[PDB]
Ligand binder design. Structure first.
Ligand SMILES: *Cc1c(COP(=O)(O)O)cnc(C)c1O
Ligand SMILES: *Cc1c(COP(=O)(O)O)cnc(C)c1O
Lengths: 403, 402
């Protein structure tokens, strides 16, 4: 029978209108964006409109947005810039970062690398076993005079848990007043919003952050992204990683990928127009899925890994485990004929055999983490599809148990 | 009426077959290439075929090829790796780079930044005003114990002049034998092949290089790129700029842009299939352009800037000045009704004009250089279109000088 995709957290398909915007730009807007000829001008008009659509999506200003190759580049760029700024201000002190124990690889690994190289100091703040969040008291307790950036993801890709970013920013703003009075540089705050965009409202003024990472392929756009920098070139400096021909105000040089930008901008227009519909629909079907998993297997057999009492999570995500010695997450997914899902981050799928380090940093019991499955629903996902998926998981576990 | 594009050195349109390959991958190959299910492995297979197509284009092996966002990333990545590797083996010497005085902004500016921040030393070798190349003996005379990289553009964007990259690699390999015996680390060689791909044969084995920059939008492909690394992960070290999810063997992590890669793959295919025919057609129509310009303005009025006797150049590029006090490049082009071209690196406000620094580096007399136009033709340019373009340059200059 027909397949049901429930791995939207790993990647989303392109919206038809986004593909249409890309195809048009491929044919019509092929010229160099810098040129005084009509195909270059059309390209420049594409890029300008897309920058405005992205700013509208996050409630910022187009001057605060630069286009990048993706989420990984945007996240590396923030970190890099903070090091270079600190070096500019010195040239044996090192800059210090505060982040969480559960960040995407594109934050965790540049950070670990900086410590391995003795370039930076980093505090990885654990998440509470009670809330599933970094306690903001802990982030603030970790502050030292050499601290320059707090980077805390908006929502976790594996659990859907939403982090208290607005409160972190607010506490950092009150602290920065004491610091400036003491002659210490202000601390900046980044959020990796990769998983939140298109699923719940992301507003840079409600968030209060200085930087924000945008990831197209998480909200039905193409595999590029962007970076928001508050008061870019004015209140917040940004030291490029790349050097070249002057594109993106020299913050990110290289001839602009016009068709990808047309796509990102169109994807952002859709989130602006429809975010409220998307969120509500995802929520209904994810909550339905949870209800139908407990009806079919039993409350006693299901551990809802994404659920902490009173903690916001993404509306589409359900991380759960079914009790049984034979029902490791990868092993169950291999027996499914309908469900397409994951047992973690797409880029850690190789290591599907051992529990997710992320679930383990969330305090998920080792035996429950072995059996963990991440189901993430999308814009098209229906309750009918949820019924087929649960009936697929029902047959799968029976075959692993009859073996 | 109809306009004629002669600015293909700045960018090219996409081939129809390329667009088709991209739009198909958008609909069909959208799953995460890291994911194990059905949709993932379809994307993976698009990426592997594309990397095979890239390999075949340059005469290499798919294991030696990583995908990047474009040529600027690829160029910066090579310079960055050499610095991080030097810092690795030191664990107050600095790494040293030899390059030319005529490189693209994505090579010159990252090196210039490195010398400004005191991270590296750089020798910008000038070009010979007899050959218009950076002679190999001048490159070898720049070598010092801290030298780790020579990077020399395969063909120049401005003039289309081809550099002697094979002889550079051959001599450096020979110098490297004596180095390793003296305990010194070997010198690696990079070429920015941006302007040569799809215009002439490019073969990693004939060029001898350790790195080579590939740029899709210069051969009717998308606005992404790739980097060849000889013996990647075995013989030649690459130290990444980016850190993340393990993609491109951890040399360039980040989820793979599969429709762009599918495009670049298709564009690489068309080059392998048709490089000879593209080259010959280009050379035909460019040569016709130059004979038409001379027939129409006179041999005395036209200064061909690209041209050094017995020096190879791209088949499609014609950089030339028309003699006259009013005829700065941008002034003539602004008067044209058909021709679309460029003035390359030249600038103009209203205080005055600045000729291309690149042409001045080739020794073009300042006054000639101020009048320089870069015309670069493409796969579809016809002799009939050249004729329209010469007619247009004629009416353009006529209105400027009476
Ligand atoms: C997908 C994602 C990113 C960006 O990763 P890419 O592989 O470059 O697209 C960053 N952070 C989170 C939390 C993500 O889910
Ligand atoms: C066009 C070009 C590049 C790469 O430039 P991008 O803007 O990144 O596409 C590199 N080298 C040369 C010689 C070029 O012409």
């Amino acid at each position: 029978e027909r397949k049901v995709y429930m791995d939207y957290n790993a990647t989303t398909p392109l919206e038809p209108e986004v593909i249409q915007a890309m195809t048009k730009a491929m044919w019509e807007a092929w010229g160099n964006p810098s040129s005084p000829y009509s195909a270059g001008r059309k390209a420049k008009d594409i890029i300008n409109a897309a920058r405005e659509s992205l700013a509208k999506m996050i409630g910022g200003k187009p001057q605060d947005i630069i286009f990048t190759s993706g989420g990984t580049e945007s996240n590396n760029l923030v970190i890099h810039s903070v090091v270079k700024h600190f070096h500019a201000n010195q040239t044996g002190a090192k800059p210090h970062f505060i982040t969480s124990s559960v960040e995407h690889d594109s934050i965790r690994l540049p950070l670990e690398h900086l410590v391995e190289e003795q370039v930076a100091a980093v505090t990885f703040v654990p998440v509470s076993k009670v809330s599933g969040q970094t306690e903001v008291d802990d982030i603030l307790a970790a502050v030292r005079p050499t601290t320059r950036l707090v980077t805390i993801m908006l929502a976790n890709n594996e659990t859907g848990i939403v982090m208290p970013v607005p409160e972190i920013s607010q506490r950092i703003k009150a602290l920065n007043q004491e610091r400036v009075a003491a002659g210490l540089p202000p601390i900046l705050v980044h959020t990796d919003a990769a998983q939140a965009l298109g699923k719940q409202r992301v507003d840079v003024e409600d968030l209060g952050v200085d930087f924000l990472t945008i990831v197209g392929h998480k909200f039905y756009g193409p595999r590029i992204g962007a970076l928001y920098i508050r008061g870019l070139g004015e209140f917040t400096p940004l030291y490029p990683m790349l050097f070249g021909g002057g594109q993106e105000r020299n913050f990110r040089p290289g001839t602009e990928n016009t068709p990808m930008i047309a796509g990102l901008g169109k994807a952002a227009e859709l989130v602006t127009q429809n975010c409220e519909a998307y969120e509500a629909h995802m929520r209904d079907v994810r909550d339905y899925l949870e209800e139908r998993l407990e009806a079919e297997f039993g409350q006693k057999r299901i551990h809802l890994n994404s659920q902490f009492p009173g903690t916001q999570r993404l509306p589409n995500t359900c991380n759960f485990s079914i009790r049984g010695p034979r029902l490791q997450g990868h092993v169950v997914l291999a027996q499914c004929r309908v469900l397409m899902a994951s047992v973690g981050a797409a880029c850690h799928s190789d290591h599907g055999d051992q529990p997710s380090p992320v679930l383990l940093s969330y305090g998920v019991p080792f035996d429950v983490a072995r059996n963990a499955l991440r189901l993430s629903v999308g814009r098209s996902t229906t309750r009918a599809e949820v019924d087929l998926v649960v009936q697929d998981l029902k047959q799968a576990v029976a075959q692993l148990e009859d073996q």
